[PDB]
Design an enzyme around this catalytic site. Structure first.
Site, PDB file in Angstrom:
ATOM      1  N   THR A 125       0.843  -1.238   0.000  1.00  0.00           N
ATOM      2  CA  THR A 125       0.000   0.000   0.000  1.00  0.00           C
ATOM      3  C   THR A 125       0.870   1.277   0.000  1.00  0.00           C
ATOM      4  O   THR A 125       1.926   1.318   0.588  1.00  0.00           O
ATOM      5  CB  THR A 125      -1.014  -0.043   1.162  1.00  0.00           C
ATOM      6  OG1 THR A 125      -1.800  -1.230   1.039  1.00  0.00           O
ATOM      7  CG2 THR A 125      -1.962   1.155   1.163  1.00  0.00           C
ATOM      8  N   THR A 167      -3.193   0.422  -3.741  1.00  0.00           N
ATOM      9  CA  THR A 167      -2.665  -0.855  -3.274  1.00  0.00           C
ATOM     10  C   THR A 167      -2.828  -1.995  -4.281  1.00  0.00           C
ATOM     11  O   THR A 167      -3.797  -2.022  -5.041  1.00  0.00           O
ATOM     12  CB  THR A 167      -3.352  -1.294  -1.939  1.00  0.00           C
ATOM     13  OG1 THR A 167      -2.726  -2.488  -1.438  1.00  0.00           O
ATOM     14  CG2 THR A 167      -4.847  -1.563  -2.143  1.00  0.00           C
ATOM     15  N   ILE A 168      -1.880  -2.929  -4.268  1.00  0.00           N
ATOM     16  CA  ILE A 168      -2.041  -4.227  -4.930  1.00  0.00           C
ATOM     17  C   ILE A 168      -2.200  -5.296  -3.823  1.00  0.00           C
ATOM     18  O   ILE A 168      -2.146  -6.503  -4.076  1.00  0.00           O
ATOM     19  CB  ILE A 168      -0.870  -4.586  -5.869  1.00  0.00           C
ATOM     20  CG1 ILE A 168       0.483  -4.534  -5.113  1.00  0.00           C
ATOM     21  CG2 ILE A 168      -0.862  -3.695  -7.100  1.00  0.00           C
ATOM     22  CD1 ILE A 168       1.633  -5.117  -5.904  1.00  0.00           C
ATOM     23  N   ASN A 169      -2.460  -4.810  -2.610  1.00  0.00           N
ATOM     24  CA  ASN A 169      -2.620  -5.624  -1.406  1.00  0.00           C
ATOM     25  C   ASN A 169      -1.297  -6.096  -0.777  1.00  0.00           C
ATOM     26  O   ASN A 169      -0.554  -5.282  -0.257  1.00  0.00           O
ATOM     27  CB  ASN A 169      -3.627  -6.766  -1.581  1.00  0.00           C
ATOM     28  CG  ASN A 169      -4.063  -7.331  -0.233  1.00  0.00           C
ATOM     29  OD1 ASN A 169      -4.039  -6.616   0.752  1.00  0.00           O
ATOM     30  ND2 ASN A 169      -4.439  -8.600  -0.187  1.00  0.00           N
ATOM     31  N   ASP A 220      -8.727  -9.694   0.434  1.00  0.00           N
ATOM     32  CA  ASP A 220      -9.460  -8.850   1.385  1.00  0.00           C
ATOM     33  C   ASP A 220     -10.917  -9.211   1.559  1.00  0.00           C
ATOM     34  O   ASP A 220     -11.576  -8.620   2.408  1.00  0.00           O
ATOM     35  CB  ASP A 220      -9.367  -7.376   1.030  1.00  0.00           C
ATOM     36  CG  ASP A 220      -8.059  -6.759   1.467  1.00  0.00           C
ATOM     37  OD1 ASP A 220      -7.315  -7.386   2.276  1.00  0.00           O
ATOM     38  OD2 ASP A 220      -7.776  -5.652   0.975  1.00  0.00           O
ATOM     39  N   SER A 243     -11.978  -2.551   2.760  1.00  0.00           N
ATOM     40  CA  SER A 243     -10.612  -2.026   2.848  1.00  0.00           C
ATOM     41  C   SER A 243     -10.432  -1.222   4.122  1.00  0.00           C
ATOM     42  O   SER A 243     -11.389  -0.604   4.590  1.00  0.00           O
ATOM     43  CB  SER A 243     -10.333  -1.107   1.670  1.00  0.00           C
ATOM     44  OG  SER A 243      -9.034  -0.556   1.760  1.00  0.00           O
ATOM     45  N   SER A 244      -9.210  -1.207   4.660  1.00  0.00           N
ATOM     46  CA  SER A 244      -8.867  -0.370   5.815  1.00  0.00           C
ATOM     47  C   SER A 244      -8.377   1.006   5.394  1.00  0.00           C
ATOM     48  O   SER A 244      -8.179   1.895   6.246  1.00  0.00           O
ATOM     49  CB  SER A 244      -7.786  -1.035   6.661  1.00  0.00           C
ATOM     50  OG  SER A 244      -8.133  -2.374   6.981  1.00  0.00           O
ATOM     51  N   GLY A 277      -2.219  -2.263   6.118  1.00  0.00           N
ATOM     52  CA  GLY A 277      -3.338  -3.155   6.367  1.00  0.00           C
ATOM     53  C   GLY A 277      -4.297  -2.609   7.392  1.00  0.00           C
ATOM     54  O   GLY A 277      -4.669  -1.445   7.331  1.00  0.00           O
TER      55      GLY A 277
HETATM   56 CL   LIG Z   1       2.641   4.963   2.196  1.00  0.00          CL
END
Ligand SMILES: [Cl-]
Ligand SMILES: *[C@@H]1O[C@H](CO)[C@@H](O)[C@H](O)[C@H]1NC(C)=O
Ligand SMILES: *[C@@H]1O[C@H](CO)[C@@H](O)[C@H](O)[C@H]1NC(C)=O
Ligand SMILES: *[C@@H]1O[C@H](CO)[C@@H](O)[C@H](O)[C@H]1NC(C)=O
Ligand SMILES: *[C@@H]1O[C@H](CO)[C@@H](O)[C@H](O)[C@H]1NC(C)=O
Ligand SMILES: *[C@@H]1O[C@H](CO)[C@@H](O)[C@H](O)[C@H]1NC(C)=O
Ligand SMILES: *[C@@H]1O[C@H](CO)[C@@H](O)[C@H](O)[C@H]1NC(C)=O
Ligand SMILES: [Cl-]
Ligand code: NA
Lengths: 189, 342
Positions: free
Chosen positions: A1, A19-21, A43, A71-72, A94
């Site tokens: 992220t 993000t790409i997780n 996720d 998502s967070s 995360g």
């Molecule tokens: Cl960052």
């Protein structure tokens, strides 16, 4: 992220988290295009996967075709009553994104720490499940003691907690900070 | 430098990318142009974190109309996805089946259509250079590369760019991304449509399915970034805070701060160990209460979260939670009423 914060000369602002997780996402890289593909499907909640001991699946966040996973992430812009931007802030890390972002805001808006201090200040995290309070290595140990005597089980994060980028409007203009936990640095004019 | 700037600022997690955003500003770009230009660069320098294979949200504020908006360009489950497709963490974390439909490029395009001042191609230019010429591996990526050494070294397609003599690159060593450079160039010239319904599309589908995924061309053709004209907001003192609602965690953030604002924290709150300890305890308890409610959240198009989010953003509801925070003790999980249905 990655989190990014931008204030333009006209006072317009962007707060952007992307993000790409997980690290290298799916670990699928195209040999032709070089694109590295996300593993964002992770996720979602799945009825057949237990993550944490005693934590059940969340039916609100099951996979359906066309659905987005919870998502967070929380890219935020704080604007003053006069219409001027006060803070541009967000994080990576995360489930720690949301607590880290809250902390940056608390540290600056209430404790009165400048943006660099607000970003560098030690953090902590509790997400209810699991039942543990994670503190950074250099937290004030009066905090650790205050938590432990109130029955929190604490543990020290092996690395660090989240990564915050922020801009705050000040007397001298726009103060910017990149989190030394990842080694970024701001730029402006 | 202290990084206080009179006119404009970009804060990114790589120096070179902050500078790229700053240069776009200096050349006349909007806040959005700088962000898009910085993001394309982070996709290179922190390739492990984000990029055109993923998705993003933008919270954008216009100081002229004084309006905030949110751009939702997060990935979506493919058309062929279903609730029980995975049976282990490993299946949902690794390989093509773990891939959701990337939204990043549609997201840059929508933000730029609405807010851009520099030409699309100009946003990619400095990142095209960077990927061809190379850069020293930074601290973050070095750590990620270390963390994932095993999988990287045993996968030839990743070792191809991420290794030096079959061993993962280390901090300070040169990383070049020559295929991404080409891809960024195509995107610069042909536009977003090249990714989603254009010259890159069949290749994407083929890479994902070869690794066992199920994304099809129709998924890409169908992907849409979404404008959210009314983002979540909460009032704090004389300020408003704009943030994305579900499927992101604005509601969790809102609830944490609404619980905490009722304690009226100030610099006094941290001045003595007595007060500091109580302050941080209160913070952790607000985290706990906020995350209890988080398990009800999900994509609002598939799940009705209207009232879950009403509660989480309500001050009265936050006052009810603040009153259950005991100053002398934390509590067991069930005290916070985490819910998994309604
Ligand atoms: Cl960052
Ligand atoms: C897991 O199990 C379900 C139900 O048996 C099945 O439909 C699915 O294909 C399996 N998936 C994987 C990735 O093993
Ligand atoms: C803000 O709105 C003004 C007036 O409508 C417009 O000219 C400008 O492009 C907008 N700013 C940004 C950064 O989009
Ligand atoms: C482009 O668009 C149409 C439908 O939107 C589709 O039929 C056509 O095959 C697409 N081309 C590619 C290369 O995906
Ligand atoms: C905050 O929440 C909603 C947005 O739809 C609305 O009641 C109100 O106008 C918003 N406040 C601001 C400042 O946008
Ligand atoms: C919202 O909170 C109230 C308490 O203020 C509670 O009675 C109600 O069940 C909650 N509503 C929803 C939809 O979760
Ligand atoms: C969790 O930690 C709290 C804090 O001491 C404790 O009271 C409780 O018994 C623990 N277990 C559960 C299931 O809540
Ligand atoms: Cl490449
Ligand atoms: Na700084």
């Amino acid at each position: 992220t990655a989190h990014l914060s931008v204030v333009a000369e006209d006072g317009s602002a962007v707060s952007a988290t992307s993000t790409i997780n997980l690290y290298f996402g799916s670990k699928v890289r195209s040999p032709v295009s070089g694109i590295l593909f996300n593993n964002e499907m992770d996720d979602f909640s799945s009825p057949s996967i237990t993550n944490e001991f005693g934590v059940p699946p969340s039916p609100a966040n099951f996979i359906q075709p066309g659905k987005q996973p919870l998502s967070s992430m929380c890219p935020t812009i704080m604007v003053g009553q006069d219409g001027q931007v006060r803070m541009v802030v967000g994080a990576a890390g995360g489930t720690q994104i949301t607590t880290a972002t809250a902390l940056a805001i608390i540290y600056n808006l209430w404790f009165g720490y400048d943006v660099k201090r607000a970003v560098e200040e030690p953090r902590l995290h509790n997400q209810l499940l699991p039942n543990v309070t994670t503190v950074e290595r250099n937290i004030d140990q009066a905090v650790t003691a205050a938590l432990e005597t109130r029955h929190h089980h604490t543990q020290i994060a092996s690395t660090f907690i989240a990564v915050v980028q922020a801009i705050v409007r000040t007397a001298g203009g726009w103060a910017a900070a990149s989190d030394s936990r990842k080694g970024g640095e701001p730029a402006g004019y | 430098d202290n990084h206080v700037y009179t006119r404009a600022a970009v804060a990114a997690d790589a120096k070179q990318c902050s500078k790229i955003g700053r240069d776009a500003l200096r050349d006349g770009g909007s806040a959005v142009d700088a962000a898009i230009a910085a993001l394309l660069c982070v996709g290179l320098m922190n390739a492990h974190s984000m990029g055109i294979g993923g998705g993003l949200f933008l919270t954008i504020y216009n100081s002229t109309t004084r309006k905030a908006e949110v751009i939702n360009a997060r990935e979506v489950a493919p058309r062929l996805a279903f609730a029980t497709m995975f049976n282990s963490s490993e299946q949902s974390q690794k390989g093509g089946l773990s891939v959701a439909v990337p939204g990043e490029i549609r997201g840059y395009e929508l933000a730029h259509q609405r807010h851009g001042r520099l030409p699309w191609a100009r946003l990619f230019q400095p990142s095209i250079q960077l990927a061809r010429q190379g850069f020293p591996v930074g601290k973050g990526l070095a750590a990620a590369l270390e963390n994932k050494r095993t999988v990287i070294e045993q996968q030839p397609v990743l070792c191809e760019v991420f290794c030096r003599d079959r061993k993962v690159l280390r901090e300070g060593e040169r990383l070049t991304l020559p295929q991404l450079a080409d891809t960024y160039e195509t995107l610069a010239i042909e536009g977003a449509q090249a990714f989603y319904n254009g010259s890159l599309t069949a290749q994407i589908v083929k890479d994902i399915q070869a690794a066992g995924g199920i994304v099809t061309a129709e998924d890409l053709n169908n992907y849409r970034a979404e404008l959210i004209e009314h983002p979540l907001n909460i009032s704090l003192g004389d300020a408003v805070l704009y943030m994305p609602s579900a499927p992101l965690s604005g509601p969790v953030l809102a609830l944490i701060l609404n619980i905490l604002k009722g304690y009226n924290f100030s610099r006094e709150s941290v001045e003595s160990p007595e007060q500091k300890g109580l302050t941080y305890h209160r913070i952790v308890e607000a985290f706990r209460f906020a995350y209890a409610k988080r398990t009800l959240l999900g994509d609002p198009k598939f799940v009705d979260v209207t009232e879950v989010v009403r509660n989480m953003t309500s001050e009265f509801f936050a006052a009810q939670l603040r009153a259950q925070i005991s100053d002398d003790t934390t509590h067991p999980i069930s005290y916070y009423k985490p819910e998994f249905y309604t």
